[PDB]
Amino acid sequence: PLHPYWPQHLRLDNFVPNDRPTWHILAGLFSVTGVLVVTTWLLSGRAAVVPLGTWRRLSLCWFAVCGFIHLVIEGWFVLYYEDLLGDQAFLSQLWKEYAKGDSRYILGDNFTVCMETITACLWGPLSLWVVIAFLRQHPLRFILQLVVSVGQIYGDVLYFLTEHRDGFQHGELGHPLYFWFYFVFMNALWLVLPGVLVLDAVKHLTHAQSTLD
Amino acid sequence: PLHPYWPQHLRLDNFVPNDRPTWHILAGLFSVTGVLVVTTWLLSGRAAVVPLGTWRRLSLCWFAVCGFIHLVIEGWFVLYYEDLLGDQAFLSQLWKEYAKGDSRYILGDNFTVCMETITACLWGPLSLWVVIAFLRQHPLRFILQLVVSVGQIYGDVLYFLTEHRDGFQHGELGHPLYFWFYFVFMNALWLVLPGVLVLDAVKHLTHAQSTLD
Ligand SMILES: CN1C(=O)N(c2ccc(C(F)(F)F)cc2)C(=O)C12CCN(CC1CCOCC1)CC2
Numbered sequence: 312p313l314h315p316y317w318p319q320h321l322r323l324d325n326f327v328p329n330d331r332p333t334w335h336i337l338a339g340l341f342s343v344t345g346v347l348v349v350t351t352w353l354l355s356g357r358a359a360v361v362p363l364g365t366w367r368r369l370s371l372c373w374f375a376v377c378g379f380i381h382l383v384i385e386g387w388f389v390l391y392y393e394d395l396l397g398d399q400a401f402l403s404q405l406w407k408e409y410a411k412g413d414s415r416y417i418l419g420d421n422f423t424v425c426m427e428t429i430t431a432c433l434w435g436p437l438s439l440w441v442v443i444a445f446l447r448q449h450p451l452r453f454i455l456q457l458v459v460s461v462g463q464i465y466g467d468v469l470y471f472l473t474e475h476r477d478g479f480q481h482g483e484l485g486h487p488l489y490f491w492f493y494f495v496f497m498n499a500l501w502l503v504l505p506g507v508l509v510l511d512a513v514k515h516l517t518h519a520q521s522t523l524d
Numbered sequence: 525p526l527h528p529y530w531p532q533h534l535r536l537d538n539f540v541p542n543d544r545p546t547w548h549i550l551a552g553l554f555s556v557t558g559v560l561v562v563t564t565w566l567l568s569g570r571a572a573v574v575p576l577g578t579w580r581r582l583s584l585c586w587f588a589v590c591g592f593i594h595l596v597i598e599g600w601f602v603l604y605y606e607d608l609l610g611d612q613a614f615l616s617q618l619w620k621e622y623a624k625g626d627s628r629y630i631l632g633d634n635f636t637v638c639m640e641t642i643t644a645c646l647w648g649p650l651s652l653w654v655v656i657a658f659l660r661q662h663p664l665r666f667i668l669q670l671v672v673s674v675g676q677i678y679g680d681v682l683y684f685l686t687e688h689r690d691g692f693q694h695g696e697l698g699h700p701l702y703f704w705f706y707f708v709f710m711n712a713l714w715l716v717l718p719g720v721l722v723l724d725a726v727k728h729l730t731h732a733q734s735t736l737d
């Protein structure tokens with residue numbers, strides 16, 4: 312009615328629609344991610360102590376991206392979820408757009424705020440320590456890769472179950488953009504890749520423990 | 525009024541007070557924990573491939589205790605939280621007693637049910653695998669100790685934050701038994717010991733990675 316979010320009966324007063332077009336936000340976000348991924352490729356080649364494999368340099372790109380997303384994008388929510396509706400700022404309009412796939416991000420849901428606080432505070436800084444560790448070949452490098460990836464999967468599984476328990480009321484089911492892209496896909500990225508990185512860290516640490524015997 | 529839980533205005537109909545005295549439940553639980561800890565001490569001494577240190581055998585006692593609690597006690601909640609009020613089974617009277625420090629366990633809270641579901645399904649069976657692994661000196665033994673310990677702390681931190689965000693409405697503040705013992709202490713056990721076990725697993729795995737170089 313006055314707003315696009317779900318369920319439709321919510322009385323979300325103080326809401327003001329996005330001032331910018333939606334493509335400035337998604338074009339702008341794509342650039343900063345692009346700059347980061349390419350420069351991570353440059354920084355991996357130059358500043359590494361040993362020649363990293365191609366899939367290893369890509370792995371540092373993933374951790375560099377996650378570090379920025381948790382620290383800056385999700386950090387903004389944890390600070391300003393109280394006044395996110397009706398705010399004219401780049402990150403505020405990103406969340407107003409994203410929250411159409413899950414209205415819990417505008418309502419300041421108790422679980423969502425607490426989960427995001429841990430993600431922004433821990434897995435942001437630790438994602439940067441994984442990147443630094445692999446360049447210098449520090450012994451903690453595979454242990455940190457495990458601790459961050461396990462921490463992300465646990466938060467992501469709780470995210471999907473708690474919504475399923477409510478019955479997906481915070482977003483129209485089966486919608487192409489708001490459901491299958493915003494809710495299913497980009498949340499499932501932190502469910503599948505990280506699972507591949509858990510299997511990798513286990514393999515190298517299992518061999519590390521076997522050689523010590 | 526008709527019930528002892530908080531906040532006092534809740535209309536918790538279909539509630540029937542505990543049929544047994546409270547001390548049968550606490551005495552009964554103490555015994556099974558006692559039997560488990562002592563037999564873990566016996567099983568550690570006999571069936572270990574190498575002579576374990578004293579603190580290592582105690583560590584297997586902790587994991588054996590955790591495995592039983594998650595699988596059997598918290599498994600019961602995940603199955604029967606729908607009709608926990610008014611039930612007469614032994615474990616139902618345990619939760620009716622425990623839920624006086626946090627009424628979310630009788631209300632079937634969305635976060636609590638989903639957190640407990642993961643606690644019972646994964647962190648119970650993994651706790652048993654830590655115990656088996658250390659007896660046989662399998663290379664995964666310290667990796668599982670790290671994996672098991674990390675998410676228990678993650679679940680515990682989320683448990684305490686979400687209650688703080690609500691303002692501790694689900695239990696009277698400052699009460700000696702219901703607050704400081706049920707809510708603060710026994711939940712803080714999974715906050716502090718597991719943190720000591722994380723530092724232990726890191727210490728042995730950091731050395732494992734250093735020797736492989
Ligand atoms: C609001 N978001 C957001 O805009 N992107 C996003 C989308 C596209 C790009 C790209 F391609 F342009 F670069 C970059 C970032 C996200 O990933 C989230 C939504 C999903 N969450 C994942 C959390 C992880 C912890 O568990 C809970 C779920 C993070 C923030």
Ligand SMILES: CN1C(=O)N(c2ccc(C(F)(F)F)cc2)C(=O)C12CCN(CC1CCOCC1)CC2
Nearest residue numbers: 553554557593597622643676679680683710711714
């Ligand atoms: C209902 N409970 C319960 O009765 N005991 C309990 C109390 C005394 C004994 C003892 F001493 F007699 F042996 C044994 C067990 C618990 O520990 C919990 C309450 C605390 N939770 C901890 C979870 C962990 C995951 O994060 C969230 C918190 C587990 C169940």
